[PDB]
Amino acid sequence: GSSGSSGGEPGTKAKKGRRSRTVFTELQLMGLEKRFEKQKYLSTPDRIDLAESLGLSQLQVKTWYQNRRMKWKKSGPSSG
């Protein structure tokens, strides 16, 4: 036989942007939800094309998305 032994990451990090400043307009949000929904994660160029269509910043999609994912996911350790 032959199976892995140990594959640990060389080093990772996480950042938090809990800021109640960024605001999206009903219009912008509408589009953001449409895209994300269709494609949980956009591509390098794609994300750009969108930010240009709605007038948002590439960062928006990136961040906004990640944040959305959280809710999108589902954790059920024990219900009861």
UniProtKB/Swiss-Prot annotation:
UniProt subcellular location: Nucleus
Tissue specificity note: Widely expressed. Expressed at higher levels in testis and heart. Detected in craniofacial tissue and adult iris, but not in lymphocytes, fibroblasts, choroid retina, retinal pigment epithelium, kidney, or fetal liver.
Sections of the chain in a coiled coil: none
DNA-binding region: 17-74
Family of this protein: Belongs to the BAR homeobox family.
Functional description taken from the UniProt entry: Transcription factor, which is involved in craniofacial development, in odontogenesis and in stomach organogenesis. May have a role in the differentiation of molars from incisors. Plays a role in suppressing endodermal Wnt activity. Binds to a regulatory module of the NCAM promoter.
Protein's UniProt name: Homeobox protein BarH-like 1
Organism, scientific name: Homo sapiens (Human)
